């Protein structure tokens, strides 16, 4: 998210075991870094290898 030009980055990492669909469980993310960029974002793209 972007808050008054500050872009907040949240991340959480945990192992799982899944075949399909998605796991059902609770998680709590934490802020990684603060990026004082100050730009408007209206679209995004996903990067895959």
């Amino acid at each position: 998210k972007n808050i008054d030009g500050y872009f907040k980055i949240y991340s959480k990492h945990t192992p799982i075991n899944l075949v399909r669909d998605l796991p059902q469980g609770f998680s709590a993310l934490e802020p990684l870094v603060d990026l004082p960029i100050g730009i408007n974002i209206t679209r995004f793209q996903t990067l895959l290898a």
Binding site: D4, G5, Y6, P36, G38
Partner: protein, 49 residues
């Protein structure tokens, strides 16, 4: 005739007069607006009690 190259080269020598000696001039422009964030002034701490 009536045509000169706008740019001219400086003449710098150790024995040149004080007026012609090279002086490194750097201007720091500080602008106050609403677009965070940039460098802030020095922040000093004190002994903890």
């Amino acid at each position: 005739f009536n045509c000169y190259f706008p740019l001219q080269s400086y003449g710098f020598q150790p024995t040149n007069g004080v007026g012609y000696q090279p002086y490194r001039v750097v201007v720091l422009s500080f602008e106050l607006l609403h677009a965070p964030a940039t460098v802030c002034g020095p922040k000093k701490s004190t002994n903890l009690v």
